[PDB]
Structure 1
Amino acid sequence: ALSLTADQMVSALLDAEPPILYSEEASMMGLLTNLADRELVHMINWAKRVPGFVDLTLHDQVHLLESAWLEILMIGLVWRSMEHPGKLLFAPNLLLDRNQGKSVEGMVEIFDMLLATSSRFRMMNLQGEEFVCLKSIILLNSGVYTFKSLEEKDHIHRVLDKITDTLIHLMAKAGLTLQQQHQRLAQLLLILSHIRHMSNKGMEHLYSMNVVPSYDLLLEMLD
């Protein structure tokens, strides 16, 4: 895992991308819940293809997915919605705007944060290569502060360090100056703080109404 080149890390992450799933006012939360449940399975198979992930124990793989899964669903939604300003593309047959999110209490606040994240992506001209790097960072970093355990944390940080090398490489070969490379790297990672914030408020909203996937479910999906 730690021997891959920057170009090979990108190629591995791109090839590992999950498919875009389809949907099957009151029934809206039923559709969105069922869509997320089916996405999670493909998320598990994506995670196993993130270089270095399967080197961790099963127990540590599950905990990483427990802490990261909602963030990953969200950043994928934000990416899907990037070229659809003012709307969220949950699925190709489920394109919702801000108005349809007002039906549920506490819903449009998260809707607006997702819309603003997608606009932020738009005006940074986020590239697919960068997006898959960002998604893998969320997987490895979201649970690292909440765990042999020293070796696992060291391994996680080594892989996080190579993704950083990979993001700098993509920026460098795009023509960015060294100053622009540091600045863009920081800009992308500060967005990860807003995604974590979005995921926290999203979880609170979910709990205000089977909220999280169980440890046994995640473990079984890992196979």
Structure 2
Amino acid sequence: CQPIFLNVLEAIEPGVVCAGHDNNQPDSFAALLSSLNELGERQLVHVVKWAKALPGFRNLHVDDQMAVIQYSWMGLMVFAMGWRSFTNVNSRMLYFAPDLVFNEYRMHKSRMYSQCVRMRHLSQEFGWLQITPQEFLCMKALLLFSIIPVDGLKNQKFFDELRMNYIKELDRIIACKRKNPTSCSRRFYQLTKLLDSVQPIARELHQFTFDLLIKSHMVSVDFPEMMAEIISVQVPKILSGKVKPIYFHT
């Protein structure tokens, strides 16, 4: 008995985070998005402290730590939101936060229905593939190291090593159960397919939040500090092609 890696992931797993949305007032595009933007600002802080508590993370260069966080904050938050939706309301609604649950009506009011549907579909994959709590944690941590600039990072060497170790950890979680190599191999295939399906979803939201920031003043949408900063400086690099995700399959 020495599941050191798994113990840490479960120990640093962020807690509940509210958005502070007023569910007593009628829904409106402006109010809904502004609340999500706030929820994002609040989440980002938790993610920063979460990633810094991850094994080996500290090895990365000070600038690369911030970089990976600023590039995958979108993918990480969605993957976690999809899980909450499955374990809380069985993927029937998007459980963004306790005080911010989106239904068929809100998905429409948000003016991003198509994107919400895709996130719900992702949430459903958790049930169709019978994803275990331990498998979820590993995959989420792996997402952090799933998007870097095509020109590599400051110390790209250390990054590949850390990623390799997290992938190795995913196999242990799979192997430490199955007996035959047919089940393990098959399982790895399924999980990798699940992780890649996240990238497409993330890119669609990256474009939506970017365009929204440009018209924010026009639609009366409030963008927090870091949120506006990261979206107008980091996000563009991804949409331009300077920063691309790391797919397992082609």
TM-score bin, normalised by smaller chain? 0.7 to 0.9
What is the rounded CA distance, in whole Å, between the counterparts of 1:146 and 1:77 in structure 2? Answer: 30
The corresponding residue for 2:95 is 89
Identity over the aligned pairs, expressed in percent?
A: 20
Give per-residue Cα distances to partners, 1:176-206, cap 9 Å, x unaligned: 5322212212221222222111111001111
Give per-residue Cα distances to partners, 1:71-119, cap 9 Å, x unaligned: 01111101111132220111123222222211233x0111000000010
**What amino acid sits opposite 1:205 in the alignment?**
F
The corresponding residue for 1:140 is 145
Please, what TM-score do these two structures have when normalized by structure 1?
0.85
Distance 1:55 1:6, change over 3 A: farther
The alignment yields a C-alpha RMSD, in angstroms, of: 2.3
Matched, 1:205 2:205: no
Please, what TM-score do these two structures have when normalized by structure 2?
0.77
Number of residue-to-residue matches in the alignment:
209
**What amino acid sits opposite 2:100 in the alignment?**
L
Distance 1:18 1:145, change over 3 A: farther
* Runs of 5+ consecutive residues of structure 2 not aligned to the other structure: 21-26, 213-222, 235-250
| Offset, 1:146 | 4.6
What is the rounded CA distance, in whole Å, between the counterparts of 1:179 and 1:104 in structure 2? Answer: 44
- Given that 1:10 and 1:129 are in contact with CA atoms closer than 8 Å, whether structure 2 keeps it comes out as yes
Distance 1:184 1:191, change over 3 A: same
The corresponding residue for 1:131 is 136
- Given that 1:64 and 1:144 are in contact with CA atoms closer than 8 Å, whether structure 2 keeps it comes out as no
What is the rounded CA distance, in whole Å, between the counterparts of 2:179 and 2:128 in structure 1? Answer: 16
- Given that 1:17 and 1:46 are in contact with CA atoms closer than 8 Å, whether structure 2 keeps it comes out as yes
| Offset, 1:13 | 1.2
What is the rounded CA distance, in whole Å, between the counterparts of 1:148 and 1:203 in structure 2? Answer: 21
The corresponding residue for 1:60 is 64
* Runs of 5+ consecutive residues of structure 1 not aligned to the other structure: 219-223
Matched, 1:114 2:119: yes
* Stretches (4+) displaced over 6 A: none
The corresponding residue for 2:10 is 14
Q: Match of 2:136, SS? A: helix
The corresponding residue for 1:221 is none
What is the rounded CA distance, in whole Å, between the counterparts of 1:30 and 1:171 in structure 2? Answer: 40
